[PDB]
Design a protein around this ligand. Structure first.
Ligand code: OLC
Ligand code: OLC
Ligand code: CA
Ligand code: CA
Ligand code: CA
Ligand code: CA
Lengths: 178, 178
C-alpha cells in the first residue's frame, strides 16, 4: 500500500503475482518462434527486426489506450461508443501503419536486405493496424469489468501486441520466403 | 485534445510524431542484433527468447515506475528520497529476477535447449534487476528535469529496457557460447 513503510520482501510479495502471470503468458512467444525455426535459420536477418516491430505495435496500442481511458473518465465517450471508436480507429491505424512502415522499410533498404522489404513493410502496417485496435478496445473491456487500467492496461497491451505481432510477422515471412 | 470531435486525419497528425520518434529510436535494436549476427548464427534458439526477456524487462520497470510515480504524487516520497528507493529496489529486483528466472529456465528445459539454460537464466536475472532500477529512477529524473513522468514514462521504459535488455542477453551469449 504505502511504499515508504514497505520493505523489500513486502514489495516483492506485492508485485510478484502480476509479473508471474505476465511471463507465463509471455512464454508463448518462444513457442511460436520455435515453430518458425526454418525461416529464421534460412534468413538470419529476420531476427534483426523482431524488437522494433513488436515495440512499435506496443507503442501504437498504448498511445491508443491512453486516449480512450481519458475520454471515458471525462465522460467524453461512453461504453456504447465502442462500435464508433472501432470504425474510426481502423482508419487512424491504417494511416499510422503506412507512415511508420515507410520509415522502417527505409531502414531495411539501408541495411541491404532486399528479400525483407516486402516482409517488413507488410508486417508493420498490419501490426500497427491491429495493435491500434487492441489498445482502443481494452479500456472498454476493462471498464465493463470493473478494472482500473493504471496497473493493468499498459503491460496487457504490450503482451497482447507481442503475440499477435509475431503471429503476423512470421506468417508473412513464411509466405513470402518459402 | 478532445477525442470525440477529432477526425481520423486529425488523430493521425496528432499522434504520428511521437510514434515516429519512438521507431527511429527503436531501430537501434536492429543494429544491435546485427552486431551479434554471429552468435545468432551459432545458435538459432537464441532468437526464440528475445521477446520474452525484453518483454519481462519492460513489465518489471513499468511496474516499478508506477509505484514511484504514485508515491511522488501522493507525496509519500519527494525527490530527495532517491538513494533509499535505489537501495531498497535493488533488493526487490534481485528477488523478482530470481523468481521469473526460475519460471523461464523451466520453459527453456521444456523447449529442449539445455545449452541455453544458463544464458537465458542469468540474462533474465540481470535484465529484471537493472530494469527494476531504471523504472524506479526515471520518475525522480523526469521530475527534477521539468517533465511529468506520467505522460512519457511508459514507452520510455519500454525502449530503454529493449536496448539494455538486448545488450545484456547477447553479451552473456558470446561470453558463455563463444
Ligand atoms: C517450472 C517451470 C514452469 C514453466 C514451464 C512451462 C512448460 C510449457 C508451457 C508453457 C505454457 C505457455 C506456452 C504454450 C506452450 C506450448 C508448449 C510447447 O512448447 O510444446 C512443444 C513440445 O515440445 C511438444 O511436446
Ligand atoms: C468485431 C466483433 C466485436 C465483438 C467482440 C467482443 C470482444 C472484444 C472486442 C470489442 C468489445 C470490447 C468490450 C466492450 C464491452 C462493450 C459493451 C457493449 O456491448 O456495448 C454496446 C451497447 O452497450 C449494447 O446496447
Ligand atoms: Ca542462418
Ligand atoms: Ca515491449
Ligand atoms: Ca545457424
Ligand atoms: Ca555467414
Amino acid at each position: 500500500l504505502v511504499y515508504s513503510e514497505a520493505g523489500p520482501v513486502a514489495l516483492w510479495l506485492a508485485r510478484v503475482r502480476w509479473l508471474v502471470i505476465l511471463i507465463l503468458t509471455g512464454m508463448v512467444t518462444s513457442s511460436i518462434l520455435q515453430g518458425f525455426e526454418s525461416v529464421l535459420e534460412a534468413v538470419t536477418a529476420l531476427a534483426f527486426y523482431v524488437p522494433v516491430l513488436l515495440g512499435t505495435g506496443g507503442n501504437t496500442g498504448n498511445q491508443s489506450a491512453t486516449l480512450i481511458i481519458r475520454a471515458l473518465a471525462t465522460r467524453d465517450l461512453d461504453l456504447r461508443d465502442w462500435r464508433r471508436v472501432f470504425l474510426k480507429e481502423m482508419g487512424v491505424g491504417l494511416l499510422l501503419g503506412l507512415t511508420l512502415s515507410f520509415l522502417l522499410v527505409g531502414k531495411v533498404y539501408w541495411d541491404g536486405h532486399p528479400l525483407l522489404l516486402p516482409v517488413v513493410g507488410v508486417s508493420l502496417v498490419l501490426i500497427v493496424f491491429f495493435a491500434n485496435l487492441v489498445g482502443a478496445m481494452l479500456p472498454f473491456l476493462l471498464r465493463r469489468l470493473g478494472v482500473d487500467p493504471a496497473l493493468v492496461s499498459n503491460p496487457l497491451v504490450a503482451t497482447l501486441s507481442d503475440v499477435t505481432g509475431l503471429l503476423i510477422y512470421l506468417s508473412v515471412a513464411r509466405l513470402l520466403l518459402e
